[PDB]
Design an enzyme around this catalytic site. Structure first.
Site, mmCIF file in Angstrom:
data_model
loop_
_atom_site.group_PDB
_atom_site.id
_atom_site.type_symbol
_atom_site.label_atom_id
_atom_site.label_comp_id
_atom_site.label_asym_id
_atom_site.label_seq_id
_atom_site.Cartn_x
_atom_site.Cartn_y
_atom_site.Cartn_z
ATOM 1 N N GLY A 1 0.781 -1.226 0.000
ATOM 2 C CA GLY A 1 0.000 0.000 0.000
ATOM 3 C C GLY A 1 0.815 1.279 0.000
ATOM 4 N N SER A 2 2.110 1.196 0.236
ATOM 5 C CA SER A 2 2.911 2.387 0.497
ATOM 6 C C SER A 2 3.154 3.197 -0.771
ATOM 7 C CB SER A 2 4.234 1.972 1.113
ATOM 8 O OG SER A 2 5.196 3.006 1.016
ATOM 9 N N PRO A 3 2.815 4.485 -0.801
ATOM 10 C CA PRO A 3 2.989 5.271 -2.035
ATOM 11 C C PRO A 3 4.424 5.253 -2.537
ATOM 12 C CG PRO A 3 1.547 6.451 -0.493
ATOM 13 C CD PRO A 3 2.084 5.238 0.243
#
Ligand code: GSH
Length: 215
Positions: free
Chosen positions: A15-17
């Protein structure tokens, strides 16, 4: 060097941008990396094994056959030059390169910064919604919209690393129901770029699903 090369180890969380920015860069370069999940929610980045790789205990981190690197946008430009097959994603021309670099710093210092300063405290720190921090997102998007006026991409006439950087941020804003509709150049670019990005569904949206999951 005098060593059997292995896949790049890619320490990440779907999920980490900033991890998605790196993943999209690898996809655009046709690099198959060894994805190693680092579960920040149970502290895997603080274990001795990872601190030996990165004493700053941040993701994304890559280990390219003994070369350890973090800071997502430094990883992106390293991969583009070390493994690039064209001259459009990160142009060698110094002026075109400088504009790409400028947009990467804009993403990290203005757009992604404003996104995180507002949303992360509200979500994972049960913070009170700060109207001034919310408005800083719109200020950054207003500049992005100006950069895209009369342009198809954020940093020149072709897709570059700067588009991959910024789309990782903008798609996260969309996932959190931020209203992008007033920024018509941003929304035009966003709808335009997604079909052009290799593995956008697999490497970006699937992770954004994990993101909305945990929020
Ligand atoms: N400027 C860094 C930011 C990296 C970052 O903030 N990573 C977060 C996850 S999104 C992290 O690893 N937090 C754990 C920690 O710092 O201990 C980059 O662009 O790579």
């Amino acid at each position: 060097g005098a060593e059997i090369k292995m896949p790049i180890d890619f320490y990440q969380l779907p999920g980490s941008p900033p991890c998605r920015a790196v993943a999209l860069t690898a996809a655009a370069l046709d690099i198959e990396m060894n994805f190693k999940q680092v579960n920040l929610m149970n502290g895997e980045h603080l274990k001795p094994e990872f601190l030996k790789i990165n004493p700053q205990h941040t993701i994304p981190t890559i280990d390219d056959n003994g070369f350890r690197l973090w800071e997502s946008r430094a990883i992106m430009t390293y991969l583009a030059d070390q493994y690039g097959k064209n001259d459009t994603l990160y142009p060698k021309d110094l002026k075109k390169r400088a504009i790409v670099n400028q947009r990467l710093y804009f993403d990290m210092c203005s757009l992604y910064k404003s996104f995180m300063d507002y949303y992360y405290p509200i979500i994972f720190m049960k913070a009170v919604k700060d109207q001034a921090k919310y408005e800083n997102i719109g200020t950054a998007l207003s500049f992005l919209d100006k950069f895209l006026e009369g342009e198809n991409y954020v940093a020149g006439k072709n897709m570059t690393l700067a588009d991959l950087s910024i789309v990782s941020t903008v798609s996260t804003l969309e996932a959190l129901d931020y209203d992008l509709s007033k920024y018509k150049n941003v929304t035009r670019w966003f709808a335009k770029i997604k079909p052009e990005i290799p593995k956008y569904e697999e490497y970006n949206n699937a992770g954004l699903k994990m993101f909305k999951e945990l929020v």
